[PDB]
Design a protein around this ligand. Structure first.
Ligand SMILES: *Cc1cc2c(cc1C)nc1c(=O)[nH]c(=O)nc-1n2C[C@H](O)[C@H](O)[C@H](O)COP(=O)(O)OP(=O)(O)OC[C@H]1O[C@@H](n2cnc3c(N)ncnc32)[C@H](O)[C@@H]1O
Ligand SMILES: C/C=C/CC/C=C/CC/C=C/CCCCCCC(=O)OC[C@H](COP(=O)(O)OCCN)OC(=O)CCCCCCC/C=C/C/C=C/CCC
Ligand code: HEM
Ligand SMILES: O=C(Nc1ccccc1)c1ccccc1I
Ligand code: SF4
Ligand code: F3S
Ligand code: FES
Lengths: 613, 138, 239, 102
């Protein structure tokens, strides 16, 4: 306060995030004719989506004749019926349209005989509503798809007058009487504080992998947008559902794509057995992520360990053609060699299931509007939007389908732009904000910048990370989760006993990583408590105490003879977590999933069924 | 903000700031291709200077060339010393002649991989010593 | 105990009088990761939380790590530390660039040049765009290999001596390679006017095939070759 | 939108291959006509050579023009000298030959 300068910016719409989700929303808004400002802590290229290897799904019918409705069914079946079907309808239908848009933007997709966008088999996708065998609808830029996607989206975004606040750490949402006015942000370059206000705000900050000790995600995946929503009192959703990607280098935790499993790659144990045929008969080693990795983490605890210390497993490309590896998957060919020293042609890659995708995030409409939970119902938060991994329309549900997140990025980023475009026009008066607004956000900065503590940021981060890694792991019991819940609660009280060192204005990476720690902890609290509260096994979240999938009905037998279980007695519902900032208490509620589609006659609702690929 | 405006505001920001330019020649690792490009520039400058000194003496200095050579014989220097004078003429000439072809090969879009620069680079370097010792023996 | 010394460039703009200087850090390698960044991260977390650098993926695909280690411009997450304990690893910021703070360069101009070449598909009449995928042969796709992979880490452009001297006016390899990346992209219609944008002594013709770009590229690409291939187009194009 | 900067580059490579061809041709056939064309190619190539150095190092609008003017006057006086040497003296070829057997 008064030691800091304030610079109030005025815009039509603010987009916080420069990933695929953020960029598509940003330039799409500018294309609609809005004065759009994009606020991003990293340079747009550096954003994670660049690390995306697998591909982007669209029923284009380039390999075999395909219907987008088949893609709808495969997403909702994969979501363990926690997926809201109104959003899945919208995503799977726009899927072909959105991809063809990118190829037209200039995204260098791989090609085939016909000259169409090359698709290939991926994790858990089928034809004819789960009956027609293997589906090939994963459009890819040969193992570097997210890289090309981010680069072309960014490339094309220079065609419009989008104001890019590059290297700006957004701190908190500008809020007044429920209504969102934009963001208050610290400028990493000079230490200044900026109040960017708008009629609408898009939140596309991506996931929060860095809550755990081991992940595939970037160092900058710190669930910042989640925390900005958290501190506003607005609910988060399904934060206990965390995807464990089955294949990632045992060492630093880098990713080996699921495209390896779609091109003909097999997973081999300590005896050399094709062990995924022992669990899944129909899909085998190309089954859903929630089951494959949970079969792998089972093998580690068995004693059938496949390594120098019997702690990891293998992904084998020994019997794959060397001619195909050079063309289809060259990005893993380098990163397997660099991080392990593995010839992908002769040797198998040492893999270990670790944190990959955050299913939950910020509750949102199929249109993309952030929702608060009032009176056991829903309410659209005015001028607040969220898209990507940051959000939770729960188009992924309990378990995200392979190569859907990059689709989720484009589609719902685009959707956020359309919702703003239709609800109001550019040049509509920007709602003015109080002179003393976001004042505590600045004070959160100032108190943390001059922090005379006893436990430095780095030490506290590790205390959070390894706790989550052993408590909120692949399998989780009540006893372990209970210890974890008060173990994570412990470290929240430590968030003042923290000692900072760097006390400058220009590029205080020491300060931003601490702000990231506050956001990571706020993510962690809601993640662990939701898991301990949920007393069932659903998708990625699997309780050893309650390995039963608890629905409104026992869907194993016919529907007729049963009566519906009361909403507050079953577990097929969205976890709505809140947390008080001062006490660090996680109080949570629930709201129903959406079953109705956007059109029943065009796309039928898929009722809950047995879960096994 | 435009492309041209971004650069225009980049320079104002830095040239009026107490920011230091990072070290470059002080630190960057010397390589054959980089060092061999330096010599090509050097030999070019060295050669053209000689040619200019030759022209700007035909118009300026008195006498004829035969008179000038008779003045060189006046010092009646050692055959080895006159060979050293002769070698130091052809050496910068030949290097530039050989590496000049290597540049012209590159201009065709050929031989531009990293191993090829050390291969042909040595082949230029070796051709130099041979064609310089060869010509000075005439 | 296996102690490795790291000599690192440090300058803080929030301290008056403080000028550029080196700082050494000692690290046990058996506690630390195999890559250079793992050591930069270790000292930041444990020894000195002032070492301000850029890091994101530690995977070699985002291009944050870009810095000059031991005289070469590579990614800190790709260069594995020298187990030779007798040698002290020297970490420097990208060469001839304005230092914002400790190894963090000002890349504004670098990005700004990238914007000037228009790195997006341009069709003469795209009133039909959005609805149908453009056709491209498998062969026309290979023409882009080795060109798009560029993560814009600014290692190559910053390794070029011409970019050291004439960084203001000359685009550098990084930006020029992307210009070529969009030149032979069969879908693009604006191939002639893209070349005409380089019709001045500086934009393209500050290249003298010094070749530091190809030599330093962390992703293994060949910018110089693509520049040389541009020069050929520049000579042999009608209209 | 004329392409002048591109043609200049092509010109520079043309004189290079001409000057490459001339140095053995001047050895094998050392005539008076070879003397003049050698003086023509030698001074031009070098002029365009230093020109490249000047555009590289000599920064500034006001300073660069004077450097290009100096280089032009120098190259003019050089080509004049060589031609005078070809016309009023032994000539490059025959003068080189005399210098060598010494
Ligand atoms: C981890 C991962 C994920 C992944 C993948 C490979 C890896 C290693 N491969 C995929 C694939 O092949 N196909 C697919 O469908 N998904 C794949 N994924 C998952 C997917 O890539 C991610 O879920 C998705 O890319 C996330 O993208 P999103 O646009 O939503 O977010 P982001 O990429 O992380 O970008 C974040 C941007 O937000 C800005 N930011 C963040 N916090 C702030 C604050 N504090 N202030 C201002 N800006 C902020 C960042 O700057 C960044 O630009
Ligand atoms: C008065 C003060 C002037 C001061 C200036 C000092 C520079 C004088 C040197 C000029 C003579 C250069 C010739 C040397 C040479 O190239 O080898 C001769 C070789 C032997 O053949 P030969 O057998 O003697 O000749 C055939 C007749 N039998 O022949 C060749 O290979 C070259 C062919 C001749 C073309 C001339 C090239 C000129 C290059 C410029 C060098 C710049 C100098 C520095
Ligand atoms: C016949 C043999 C020669 C060949 C093949 C040749 C070729 C070349 C080429 C191609 C370049 C430009 C390098 C590039 O590609 O960027 C160059 C540079 C140059 N040359 Fe020559 N040249 C020859 C003889 C000479 C002579 C006899 C002189 C002296 C009068 C000379 C003076 C220069 C100068 C001043 C430069 C500029 C240096 C630079 O731009 O890097 N060259 N030469
Ligand atoms: O600048 C140059 N010198 C230089 C090269 C490396 C290191 C330091 C200076 C140079 C050298 C040869 C050809 C073109 C050039 I622009
Ligand atoms: S071509 Fe290579 S060195 Fe140059 S910017 Fe791209 S990735 Fe970096
Ligand atoms: S380092 Fe250089 S001068 Fe050209 S060949 Fe590469 S940009
Ligand atoms: S941090 Fe992304 S490349 Fe090193």
């Amino acid at each position: 306060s008064t030691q800091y300068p304030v610079v109030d910016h005025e815009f039509d719409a603010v987009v916080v995030g420069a990933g695929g989700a953020g960029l598509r929303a940003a330039f799409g808004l500018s294309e609609a004719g809005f004065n759009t400002a994009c606020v991003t802590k990293l340079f747009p290229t550096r954003s994670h989506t660049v690390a995306a290897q697998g591909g982007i799904n669209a029923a284009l019918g380039n390999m075999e004749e395909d219907n987008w409705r088949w893609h709808f069914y495969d997403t909702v079946k994969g979501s363990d019926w926690l997926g809201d079907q109104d959003a899945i309808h919208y995503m799977t239908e726009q899927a072909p349209a959105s991809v063809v848009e990118l190829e037209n933007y200039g995204m260098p997709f791989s090609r085939t005989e016909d000259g169409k966008i090359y698709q290939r088999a991926f994790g858990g996708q089928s034809l004819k509503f789960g009956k027609g065998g293997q589906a090939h609808r994963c459009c890819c830029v040969a193992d570097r798809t997210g890289h090309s996607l981010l680069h072309t989206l960014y490339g094309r975004s220079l065609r419009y007058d989008t104001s890019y606040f590059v290297e700006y750490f957004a701190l908190d949402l500008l809020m007044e009487n429920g209504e969102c006015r934009g963001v208050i942000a610290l400028c990493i370059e000079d230490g200044s504080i900026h109040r960017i206000r708008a009629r609408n705000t898009v939140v596309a900050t991506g996931g929060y992998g860095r809550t755990y000790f081991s992940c595939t995600s970037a160092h900058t995946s710190t669930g910042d947008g989640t925390a900005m929503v958290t501190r506003a009192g607005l609910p988060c959703q399904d934060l206990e559902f965390v995807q464990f990607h089955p294949t990632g280098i045992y060492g630093a935790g880098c990713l080996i794509t699921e495209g390896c499993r779609g091109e003909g790659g097999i997973l081999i144990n300590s005896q050399g057995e094709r062990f995924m045929e022992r669990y899944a008969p129909v899909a085998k080693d190309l089954a859903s992520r929630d089951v494959v990795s949970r079969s792998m983490t089972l093998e580690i605890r068995e004693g059938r360990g496949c390594g120098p210390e019997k702690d990891h497993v293998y992904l084998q490309l020994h019997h794959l053609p060397p001619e195909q590896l050079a063309v289809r998957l060259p990005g893993i060919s380098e990163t397997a060699m660099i991080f392990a020293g593995v010839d992908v042609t002769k040797e198998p890659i040492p893999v270990l299931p670790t944190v990959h995708y955050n299913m939950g995030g910020i509750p949102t409409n199929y249109k993309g509007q952030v929702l608060r939970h009032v009176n056991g119902q829903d309410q659209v938060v005015p001028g607040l939007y969220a898209c990507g991994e940051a959000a939770c329309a729960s188009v992924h549900g309990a378990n995200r389908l392979g190569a859907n997140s990059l689709l989720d990025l484009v589609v719902f980023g685009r959707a956020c732009a359309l919702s703003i475009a239709e609800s109001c026009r550019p040049g509509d008066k920007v709602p003015s904000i109080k002179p003393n607004a976001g004042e505590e956000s600045v004070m959160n900065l100032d108190k943390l910048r001059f922090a005379n503590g006893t436990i430095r940021t780095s030490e506290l981060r590790l205390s959070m990370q390894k706790s989550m890694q052993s408590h909120a792991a692949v399998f989780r019991v009540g006893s372990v989760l209970q210890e974890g819940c008060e173990k994570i609660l412990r470290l929240y009280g430590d968030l003042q006993h923290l000692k900072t060192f760097d006390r400058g204005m220009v590029w205080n990476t020491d300060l931003v990583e601490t702000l990231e720690l506050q956001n990571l902890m706020l993510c962690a609290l809601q993640t662990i408590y939701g898991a301990e509260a949920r007393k069932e096994s659903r998708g990625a979240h699997a309780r050893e105490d309650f390995k039963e999938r608890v629905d409104e009905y026992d869907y194993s037998k016919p529907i007729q003879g049963q009566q519906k279980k009361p909403f507050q007695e079953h577990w097929r519902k969205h976890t709505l977590s809140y947390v008080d900032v001062k006490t660090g208490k996680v109080s949570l509620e629930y709201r129903p999933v959406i079953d109705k589609t956007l059109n029943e006659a065009d796309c039928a609702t898929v009722p809950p069924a047995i879960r096994s690929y | 903000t435009t492309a041209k405006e971004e650069m225009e505001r980049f320079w104002n920001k830095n040239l009026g700031s107490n920011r230091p330019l990072s070290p470059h020649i002080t630190i960057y690792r010397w390589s054959l291709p980089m060092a061999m490009s330096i010599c090509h520039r050097g030999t070019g400058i060295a050669l053209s200077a000689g040619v200019s000194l030759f022209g700007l003496s035909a118009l300026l200095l008195p006498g004829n060339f035969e008179s000038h050579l008779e003045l060189v014989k006046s010092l009646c220097l050692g055959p080895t010393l006159i060979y050293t004078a002769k070698f130091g003429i052809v050496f910068p000439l030949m290097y530039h002649t050989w590496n000049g072809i290597r540049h012209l090969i590159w201009d065709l879009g050929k031989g531009l991989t990293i191993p090829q620069l050390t291969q042909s680079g040595v082949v230029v370097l070796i051709l130099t010593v041979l064609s310089s010792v060869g010509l000075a023996a005439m | 105990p296996r102690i490795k010394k790291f000599a690192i460039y440090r300058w803080d703009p929030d301290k008056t009088g403080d000028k550029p200087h080196m700082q050494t850090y000692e690290i046990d390698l058996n506690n630390c990761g195999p890559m250079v960044l793992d050591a930069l991260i270790k000292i930041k977390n444990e020894i000195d939380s002032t070492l301000t650098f850029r890091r994101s993926c530690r995977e070699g695909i985002c291009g944050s790590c870009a810095m000059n280690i031991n005289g070469g411009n590579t990614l800190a997450c790709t260069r594995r530390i020298d187990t030779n304990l007798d040698k002290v690893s020297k970490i420097y910021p990208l060469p001839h660039m304005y230092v914002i703070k400790d190894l963090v360069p000002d890349l504004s101009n670098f990005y700004a040049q990238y914007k000037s070449i228009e790195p997006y598909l341009k069709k003469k009449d795209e009133s039909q765009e959005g609805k149908q995928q453009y056709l491209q042969s498998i062969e026309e796709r290979e023409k882009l290999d080795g060109l798009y992979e560029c993560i814009l880490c600014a290692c190559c452009s910053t390794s070029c001596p011409s970019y050291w001297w004439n960084g203001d006016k000359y685009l550098g390899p990084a930006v020029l390679m992307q210009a070529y990346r969009w030149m032979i992209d069969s879908r693009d219609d604006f191939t002639e006017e893209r070349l005409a944008k380089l019709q001045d002594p500086f934009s393209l013709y500050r290249c003298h095939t010094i070749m530091n770009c190809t030599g330093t590229c962390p992703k293994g690409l060949n910018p110089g070759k693509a520049i040389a291939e541009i020069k050929k187009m520049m000579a042999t194009y009608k209209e | 939108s004329s392409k002048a900067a591109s043609l200049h580059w092509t010109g520079e490579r043309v004189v290079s291959v001409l000057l490459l061809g001339l140095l053995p041709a001047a050895y094998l056939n050392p005539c008076s006509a070879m003397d003049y064309s050698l003086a023509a190619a030698l001074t031009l190539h070098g002029h365009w050579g230093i020109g490249q150095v000047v555009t590289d190092y000599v920064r500034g609008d006001a300073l660069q023009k004077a450097a290009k003017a100096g280089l032009l006057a120098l190259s003019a006086f050089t080509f004049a000298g060589l031609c005078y040497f070809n016309y009023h003296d032994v000539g490059i070829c025959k003068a080189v030959a005399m210098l060598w057997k010494l």
